[PDB]
Amino acid sequence: PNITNLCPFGEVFNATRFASVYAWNRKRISNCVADYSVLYNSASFSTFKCYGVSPTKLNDLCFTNVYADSFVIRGDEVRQIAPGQTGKIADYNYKLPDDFTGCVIAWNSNNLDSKGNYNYLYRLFRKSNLKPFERDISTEIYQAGSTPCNGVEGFNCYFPLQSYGFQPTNGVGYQPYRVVVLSFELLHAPATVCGPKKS
């Protein structure tokens, strides 16, 4: 067919503001045909990591129920976003199941989030790990003992969140990085989003 429908992945990848990790932005994309070659063929995306499918056959295959997750983190922990890893961000702010069928894109945003900047938070204390793709939103005074403290912080009473000092003059690993994680299912339903067909 002459004209093929397309969905705006650009606005996802080109947005003024992103959500913090402890409240990760989740979006659903359906009923479109979006080329995937233009992504890994670019140079701005510093990290294009995924194993379940090669970049070459991204456009070859067709998928269903495309979900996108967006947030901003510190650089030195970009490794923690992978199937089956631990860490504060990998346990209390976001979870990635090992049986993951998707791909990961990460790139620097030093000149977009710098001063300095303080408005940045993430979950520090939580009861235990999270189920896959869980959204962990809450506000409670976690207690490191048995004495019950409520209302105000005190001894052994800790604030669940913490901010990030994204100074414009930081080195590698401390500059904020923007991360987009794409997930989907392999046509478990009638096809919704396929690759671009050649002519």
């Epitope: 030093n110 000092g165 003059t169 930081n170 080195g171 590698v172 690993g173």
Partner: antibody, heavy 118, light 109 residues
Framework: EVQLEESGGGLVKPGGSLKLSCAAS????????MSWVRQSPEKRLEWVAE????????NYPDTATGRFTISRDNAKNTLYLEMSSLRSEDTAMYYC???????????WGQGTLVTVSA | QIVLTQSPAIMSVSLGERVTMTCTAS???????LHWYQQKPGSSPKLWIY???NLASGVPARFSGSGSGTSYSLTISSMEAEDAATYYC?????????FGGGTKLEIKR
Amino acid sequence: EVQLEESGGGLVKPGGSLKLSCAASGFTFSSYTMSWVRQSPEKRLEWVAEISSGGTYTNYPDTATGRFTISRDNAKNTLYLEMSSLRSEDTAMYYCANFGNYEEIAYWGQGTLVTVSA
Amino acid sequence: QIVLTQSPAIMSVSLGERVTMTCTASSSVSSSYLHWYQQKPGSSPKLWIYSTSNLASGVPARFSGSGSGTSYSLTISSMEAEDAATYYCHQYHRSPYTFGGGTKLEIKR
């Protein structure tokens, strides 16, 4: 690496200006932000002034706003720092180290005695 | 900025026992930005405890501690002969960077 040789120091006059050159070699200097710290005899440490090698940016504390200047040179891998109109109270010994760069902060300088005299 | 305050000025603590040391500040700095160096007499400082929980190279897993908010705690297990050194608190969150007041750790016979 060979651990950040600093330029040799010595006694000066209250009204001169001494230059500290923390030249080194052994790791990339296009992405490693340097820093300058000083210690007076038996007194708490104090971050003098740091440089940003990513775009060679200058920012440093407000205890002395206009009398600290840093010049980086990635070509010959050298780090100039100087102060204007040094006083007799500025006697200390200086380190050049690595701040803000890759998480594993390490590699403090060998130190250099930069003291004043009268 | 935030000045780093150490509750004890000096520890004339005998050999063998196990105590704790505190770094106090006027406000919460970060979950993991602060760290501690070790300035030996007539030498340069070296970092062991980074990220407020993790340990750098060379630590025999003897030196530890935990804390968050406006006060942090660093603990030991059993004093030995090489503990006669100096420790300095740090903070990397605000524009200005400061150091801890320092503690002149010493052993008693």
